[PDB]
Amino acid sequence: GRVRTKTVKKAARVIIEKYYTRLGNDFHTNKRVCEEIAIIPSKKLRNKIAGYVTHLMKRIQRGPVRGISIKLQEEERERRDNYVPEVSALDQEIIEVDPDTKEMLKLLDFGSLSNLQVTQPTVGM
């Protein structure tokens, strides 16, 4: 029943792209805001556009949306990331992986601190 037209979704995306701070979660306010900022002749089209605008607001305010992205949402995407945990960035200096990369560290001159010794059969694939 809500499989609304591409022109309805396109008008709602133009509204949410141009004017984002004018909109909220209340349908009865967002409809009057959309009628102040746009010209729609049909009242059913008014209600449908404003309802999908409220659905886009509930989607954007909850989670990130690729389908529209203003500069304020870009700064929010920048803000949501900087809390960086320090748990597993670099491990302790005990790594055992390969005798082949042990031979690599023997050829190309480095310290080769940790042990590097595994034995594997030829049961690959």
Partner 1 sequence: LDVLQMKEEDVLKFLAAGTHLGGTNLDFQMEQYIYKRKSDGIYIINLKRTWEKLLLAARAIVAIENPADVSVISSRNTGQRAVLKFAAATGATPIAGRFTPGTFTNQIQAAFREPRLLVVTDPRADHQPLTEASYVNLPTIALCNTDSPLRYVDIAIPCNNKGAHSVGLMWWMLAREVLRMRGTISREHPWEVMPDLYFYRDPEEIEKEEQAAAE
Partner 2 sequence: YVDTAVRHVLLRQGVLGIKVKIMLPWDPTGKIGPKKPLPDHVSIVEPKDEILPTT
Summarize as ranges the residues that interact with partner 2 (CB under 8 A).
7, 11, 14-15, 18-19, 37-42, 45, 49
117 binds, among partner 1, RNA, partner 2, none (CB under 5 to 8 A by kind): none
Question: Is residue 102 a contact partner of residue 116, using CB atoms and an 8 Å limit?
Answer: yes
Instruction: Report d(CA 86, CA 110) in Å as an integer.
Output: 27
Distances (CA, A) of 77 to 4, 6, 29, 87: 29, 27, 27, 23
Should residue 125 be labelled a site residue for RNA when binding is judged by CB under 7 A? yes
Should residue 94 be labelled a site residue for RNA when binding is judged by CB under 7 A? no
First to last CA, the chain: 51
Task: Summarize as ranges the residues that interact with partner 1 (CB under 8 A).
Answer: 66, 77-78, 81-82, 84-87, 89-91, 93, 95, 97-98, 100-101, 103-105, 108, 110-111, 120-125
